[PDB]
Amino acid sequence: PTYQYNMNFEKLGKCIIINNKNFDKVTGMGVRNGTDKDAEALFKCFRSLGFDVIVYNDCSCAKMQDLLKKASEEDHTNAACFACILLSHGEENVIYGKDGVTPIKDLTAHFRGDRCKTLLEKPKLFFIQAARGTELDDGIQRYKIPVEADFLFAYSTVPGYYSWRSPGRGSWFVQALCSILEEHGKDLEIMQILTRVNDRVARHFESQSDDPHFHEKKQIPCVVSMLTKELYFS
Amino acid sequence: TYQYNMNFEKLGKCIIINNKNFDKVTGMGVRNGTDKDAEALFKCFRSLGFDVIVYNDCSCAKMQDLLKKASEEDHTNAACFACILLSHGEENVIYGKDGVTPIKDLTAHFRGDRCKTLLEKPKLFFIQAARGTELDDGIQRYKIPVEADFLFAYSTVPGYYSWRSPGRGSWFVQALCSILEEHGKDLEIMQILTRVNDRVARHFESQSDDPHFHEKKQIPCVVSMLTKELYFSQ
Amino acid sequence: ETHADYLLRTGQVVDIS
Amino acid sequence: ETHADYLLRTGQVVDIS
């Protein structure tokens, strides 16, 4: 027999959304057109879920690190969990700030059970919409707890691969995540939701571009769970 | 919305690689207790309905060959595939008798584009091995991604050590077998692994003469690229 | 130095659909 | 050298209980 995370708290929790769209020339990274659409859609979804959403924009690696560090120092006692969403450029293990790159590990470590006691035994979720490389998927027709426990990372793509988005519709992963959340965010368990998102971007999306190097390409998200209980946003 | 179709002549193969003795050159120790793990796993997966096979003290060449050959067999009448790795390990790599091989290379053999007979079928990999040496002190017309439908159930988190007792056996394996025996046939794959997560997280703690390794903790790590819910039973 | 790789490393590649 | 790191490096550290 096994339970669900206790959700009986004054509030669901905070939800830091980092919307990186414009990057310094020095980095040479392009303008992430469509990210605003993503942020708007996410903002609404997580608000509906009951999160206290906040959106930061074009943050430097320093701001992002500071942002999350500060957050980890706030008092989450009356919160059920925590949520952070990263929308930016990225490379394996790293994510882009306005001025450069920072290891995703450093961003999330701030919430280890030993560095944010107020979140111990509470789920800490991180949704990352960013590339993790450039590979393309051609497809085919007396109690103590691990300081590292209760983390869940919902990546848009698999390690080493690219992440797709349309400046019009927005990120595939984000498009998918919002759909399922809107439809089942309040009745399905977190892993069911993310699994349906996996299938969604896997089946209902395919690249399409003038250059054949990037035509009819595919993508599969990646979920990493260190959760110790089932998670229902209610 | 749905579950993986399990209506097939057989559940699938289950390659168990039991590495216990390593070449002196590697300097790796005798994984005492691994036999206990293999025996317990062998029985659990057999009960699940898998066609289990256990290999022992395999070289990186044998392991690679083993899995490559397997990926070339015809899985048409199988519902899914399962591989279990019991050996020494380091981040991203796993130990063979004679050395080290990247876990990525071991699993790539089953990409949708290299094992068509397993397309849209779940390919599970359970890895009982260290992924570093950090210790957890604890606290108070379609087309699908060639990389889809993979699930990696790691005993520990990236960069950390993995515990086992030469007597009882690996913590992760001990846990996995418990939950499987109790719910392998009625719970969804992610529920099972989540319960395993909680199990090794709460019900286990290191204990050794040397204080450097006393009262240490551990949290498993699940990586899912599955696109449907998975239940081991029609 | 490959341009088809330029849009990649720089993230310019997107889905036109 | 540190025997301790030596033990982890060779994965000889085991729970004795």
Tab-separated table of C-alpha atoms in Angstrom, chain B residues 8-228:
chain	number	residue	atom	x	y	z
B	8	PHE	CA	0.481	-10.833	-27.336
B	9	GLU	CA	1.552	-14.478	-27.310
B	10	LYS	CA	4.221	-13.585	-24.737
B	11	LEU	CA	5.193	-10.694	-22.421
B	12	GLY	CA	8.750	-10.541	-23.702
B	13	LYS	CA	12.383	-11.385	-23.009
B	14	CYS	CA	14.219	-10.272	-19.873
B	15	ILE	CA	18.011	-10.191	-20.135
B	16	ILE	CA	19.589	-10.169	-16.673
B	17	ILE	CA	23.310	-9.348	-16.591
B	18	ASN	CA	24.846	-10.410	-13.283
B	19	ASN	CA	28.354	-8.965	-12.961
B	20	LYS	CA	30.049	-10.110	-9.775
B	21	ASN	CA	33.748	-10.753	-10.452
B	22	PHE	CA	35.900	-8.157	-12.207
B	23	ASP	CA	39.382	-8.394	-13.735
B	24	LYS	CA	42.196	-7.323	-11.406
B	25	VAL	CA	43.230	-4.708	-13.982
B	26	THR	CA	39.974	-2.820	-13.345
B	27	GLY	CA	40.632	-2.810	-9.620
B	28	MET	CA	36.887	-3.162	-8.968
B	29	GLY	CA	35.710	-5.237	-6.010
B	30	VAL	CA	33.710	-8.479	-5.810
B	31	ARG	CA	30.061	-7.432	-5.832
B	32	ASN	CA	29.051	-9.751	-2.989
B	33	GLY	CA	25.284	-10.040	-2.741
B	34	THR	CA	24.618	-9.686	-6.454
B	35	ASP	CA	23.764	-13.371	-6.723
B	36	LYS	CA	21.021	-12.838	-4.153
B	37	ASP	CA	19.771	-9.928	-6.255
B	38	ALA	CA	19.771	-11.898	-9.490
B	39	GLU	CA	17.959	-14.832	-7.916
B	40	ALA	CA	15.247	-12.548	-6.522
B	41	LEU	CA	14.887	-10.628	-9.752
B	42	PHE	CA	14.889	-13.809	-11.814
B	43	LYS	CA	11.932	-15.133	-9.854
B	44	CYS	CA	10.009	-11.823	-9.845
B	45	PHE	CA	10.239	-11.273	-13.584
B	46	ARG	CA	9.515	-14.925	-14.250
B	47	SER	CA	6.328	-14.518	-12.172
B	48	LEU	CA	5.519	-11.426	-14.189
B	49	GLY	CA	5.505	-13.666	-17.232
B	50	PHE	CA	8.877	-12.730	-18.773
B	51	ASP	CA	11.197	-15.266	-20.423
B	52	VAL	CA	14.141	-14.633	-18.087
B	53	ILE	CA	17.777	-15.378	-18.930
B	54	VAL	CA	20.758	-14.685	-16.707
B	55	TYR	CA	24.266	-14.011	-17.975
B	56	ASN	CA	27.226	-13.727	-15.621
B	57	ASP	CA	30.545	-11.885	-15.361
B	58	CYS	CA	30.228	-10.435	-18.851
B	59	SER	CA	32.861	-8.367	-20.625
B	60	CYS	CA	31.873	-5.092	-22.238
B	61	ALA	CA	32.036	-6.973	-25.538
B	62	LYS	CA	29.721	-9.742	-24.425
B	63	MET	CA	27.220	-7.242	-22.997
B	64	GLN	CA	27.193	-5.171	-26.171
B	65	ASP	CA	26.971	-8.284	-28.333
B	66	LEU	CA	24.297	-9.799	-26.090
B	67	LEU	CA	22.004	-6.792	-26.373
B	68	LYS	CA	22.755	-6.233	-30.063
B	69	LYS	CA	21.827	-9.801	-30.904
B	70	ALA	CA	18.690	-9.513	-28.784
B	71	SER	CA	17.646	-6.372	-30.664
B	72	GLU	CA	17.901	-8.391	-33.867
B	73	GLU	CA	15.573	-11.154	-32.694
B	74	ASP	CA	11.911	-11.043	-33.702
B	75	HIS	CA	9.804	-9.476	-30.960
B	76	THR	CA	6.603	-9.460	-33.035
B	77	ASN	CA	4.736	-11.696	-30.598
B	78	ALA	CA	6.118	-9.947	-27.541
B	79	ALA	CA	4.394	-7.190	-25.590
B	80	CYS	CA	7.643	-5.533	-24.454
B	81	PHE	CA	11.320	-6.058	-23.594
B	82	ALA	CA	13.253	-5.964	-20.308
B	83	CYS	CA	16.932	-5.768	-19.436
B	84	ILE	CA	18.432	-5.666	-15.959
B	85	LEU	CA	22.002	-4.593	-15.284
B	86	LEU	CA	23.684	-5.615	-12.033
B	87	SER	CA	27.281	-4.402	-11.854
B	88	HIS	CA	29.716	-1.636	-10.880
B	89	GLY	CA	29.106	1.710	-12.552
B	90	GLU	CA	29.995	5.383	-12.929
B	91	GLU	CA	27.999	8.262	-14.379
B	92	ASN	CA	26.714	7.268	-17.822
B	93	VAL	CA	28.832	4.168	-17.820
B	94	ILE	CA	28.557	0.590	-16.551
B	95	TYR	CA	31.185	-2.038	-15.741
B	96	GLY	CA	31.920	-5.173	-17.678
B	97	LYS	CA	34.363	-7.789	-16.397
B	98	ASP	CA	37.165	-6.134	-18.342
B	99	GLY	CA	36.134	-2.502	-18.085
B	100	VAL	CA	33.557	0.172	-18.777
B	101	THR	CA	30.899	0.825	-21.461
B	102	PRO	CA	28.432	3.684	-21.925
B	103	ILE	CA	24.918	2.684	-20.912
B	104	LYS	CA	23.708	4.695	-23.861
B	105	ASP	CA	25.465	2.319	-26.256
B	106	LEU	CA	23.897	-0.693	-24.567
B	107	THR	CA	20.349	0.647	-24.954
B	108	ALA	CA	20.626	2.316	-28.384
B	109	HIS	CA	20.301	-1.097	-29.988
B	110	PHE	CA	16.586	-0.883	-29.289
B	111	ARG	CA	15.775	2.452	-30.879
B	112	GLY	CA	12.641	2.303	-33.010
B	113	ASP	CA	14.881	2.514	-36.052
B	114	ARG	CA	17.107	-0.387	-35.035
B	115	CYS	CA	14.613	-2.879	-33.647
B	116	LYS	CA	11.404	-2.328	-35.608
B	117	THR	CA	9.967	-5.456	-34.026
B	118	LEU	CA	9.727	-3.445	-30.765
B	119	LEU	CA	8.342	-0.169	-32.174
B	120	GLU	CA	5.528	1.219	-30.027
B	121	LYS	CA	6.377	-1.424	-27.423
B	122	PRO	CA	7.917	-0.564	-24.030
B	123	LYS	CA	11.623	-1.285	-23.631
B	124	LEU	CA	12.539	-1.364	-19.934
B	125	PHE	CA	16.018	-1.129	-18.419
B	126	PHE	CA	16.587	-1.552	-14.703
B	127	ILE	CA	20.091	-0.527	-13.683
B	128	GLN	CA	21.499	-1.476	-10.305
B	129	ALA	CA	24.865	0.300	-10.272
B	130	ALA	CA	26.591	3.417	-8.948
B	131	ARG	CA	26.526	6.553	-11.071
B	132	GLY	CA	29.313	8.285	-9.220
B	133	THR	CA	30.616	8.420	-5.660
B	134	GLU	CA	28.639	11.234	-4.047
B	135	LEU	CA	26.827	10.129	-0.885
B	136	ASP	CA	23.438	11.346	0.334
B	137	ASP	CA	23.701	12.349	3.984
B	138	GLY	CA	19.945	12.693	4.165
B	139	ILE	CA	18.125	15.138	6.388
B	140	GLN	CA	16.052	15.348	9.591
B	141	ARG	CA	0.324	7.625	-41.860
B	142	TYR	CA	2.304	8.053	-38.636
B	143	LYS	CA	5.972	8.063	-37.633
B	144	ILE	CA	7.444	7.848	-34.148
B	145	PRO	CA	10.592	9.139	-32.408
B	146	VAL	CA	13.256	6.474	-32.711
B	147	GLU	CA	13.942	7.328	-29.088
B	148	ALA	CA	10.405	6.810	-27.752
B	149	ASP	CA	9.037	4.099	-25.430
B	150	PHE	CA	12.095	3.631	-23.260
B	151	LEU	CA	12.030	3.514	-19.466
B	152	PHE	CA	15.168	3.488	-17.327
B	153	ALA	CA	14.770	2.545	-13.684
B	154	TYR	CA	18.048	3.539	-12.037
B	155	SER	CA	18.889	2.444	-8.503
B	156	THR	CA	20.379	5.864	-7.768
B	157	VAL	CA	20.547	9.470	-8.930
B	158	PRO	CA	23.240	10.773	-11.338
B	159	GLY	CA	26.616	11.211	-9.689
B	160	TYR	CA	25.789	9.274	-6.547
B	161	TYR	CA	26.762	5.901	-5.112
B	162	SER	CA	24.468	2.862	-4.939
B	163	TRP	CA	24.147	0.743	-1.785
B	164	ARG	CA	23.965	-3.003	-1.210
B	165	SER	CA	24.521	-5.417	1.679
B	166	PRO	CA	26.459	-8.619	0.875
B	167	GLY	CA	23.845	-10.298	3.016
B	168	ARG	CA	20.457	-8.870	2.055
B	169	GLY	CA	21.565	-7.578	-1.363
B	170	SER	CA	21.051	-4.226	-3.143
B	171	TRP	CA	18.621	-1.760	-1.548
B	172	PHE	CA	17.005	-0.929	-4.868
B	173	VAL	CA	16.760	-4.599	-5.842
B	174	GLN	CA	15.423	-5.512	-2.397
B	175	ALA	CA	12.786	-2.819	-2.782
B	176	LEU	CA	11.925	-3.522	-6.423
B	177	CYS	CA	11.318	-7.186	-5.666
B	178	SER	CA	9.111	-6.418	-2.652
B	179	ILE	CA	6.745	-4.075	-4.484
B	180	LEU	CA	6.748	-6.268	-7.583
B	181	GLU	CA	5.850	-9.351	-5.564
B	182	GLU	CA	3.077	-7.369	-3.872
B	183	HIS	CA	1.740	-5.360	-6.847
B	184	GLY	CA	3.599	-6.293	-10.001
B	185	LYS	CA	0.343	-7.503	-11.504
B	186	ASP	CA	-2.080	-4.811	-10.443
B	187	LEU	CA	-0.199	-1.502	-10.410
B	188	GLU	CA	0.930	0.658	-13.322
B	189	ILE	CA	4.689	0.647	-13.980
B	190	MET	CA	5.180	4.221	-12.725
B	191	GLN	CA	3.215	3.551	-9.522
B	192	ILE	CA	5.366	0.526	-8.811
B	193	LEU	CA	8.608	2.415	-9.374
B	194	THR	CA	7.381	5.358	-7.336
B	195	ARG	CA	6.642	3.042	-4.420
B	196	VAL	CA	10.118	1.618	-4.854
B	197	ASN	CA	11.465	5.166	-4.686
B	198	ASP	CA	9.754	5.785	-1.349
B	199	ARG	CA	10.820	2.373	-0.087
B	200	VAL	CA	14.558	2.818	-0.483
B	201	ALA	CA	14.160	6.463	0.551
B	202	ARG	CA	12.514	5.747	3.892
B	203	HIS	CA	13.193	2.137	4.821
B	204	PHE	CA	16.971	2.081	4.175
B	205	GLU	CA	20.007	3.742	5.741
B	206	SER	CA	23.699	2.920	5.547
B	207	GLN	CA	25.588	1.639	8.565
B	208	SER	CA	29.344	1.022	8.660
B	209	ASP	CA	32.365	1.010	10.973
B	210	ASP	CA	33.881	3.862	8.991
B	211	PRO	CA	32.047	7.142	9.813
B	212	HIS	CA	32.635	8.351	6.240
B	213	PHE	CA	29.864	5.967	5.210
B	214	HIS	CA	27.669	5.805	8.303
B	215	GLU	CA	23.905	6.443	8.237
B	216	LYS	CA	23.865	7.428	4.538
B	217	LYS	CA	20.787	7.603	2.288
B	218	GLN	CA	19.676	6.929	-1.298
B	219	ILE	CA	16.914	7.867	-3.793
B	220	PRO	CA	16.327	5.972	-7.045
B	221	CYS	CA	15.855	7.689	-10.390
B	222	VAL	CA	13.214	6.949	-13.037
B	223	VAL	CA	13.476	8.125	-16.638
B	224	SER	CA	10.403	7.606	-18.770
B	225	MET	CA	9.949	8.086	-22.495
B	226	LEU	CA	6.908	5.860	-22.402
B	227	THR	CA	3.880	7.060	-24.339
B	228	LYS	CA	1.252	4.914	-22.608
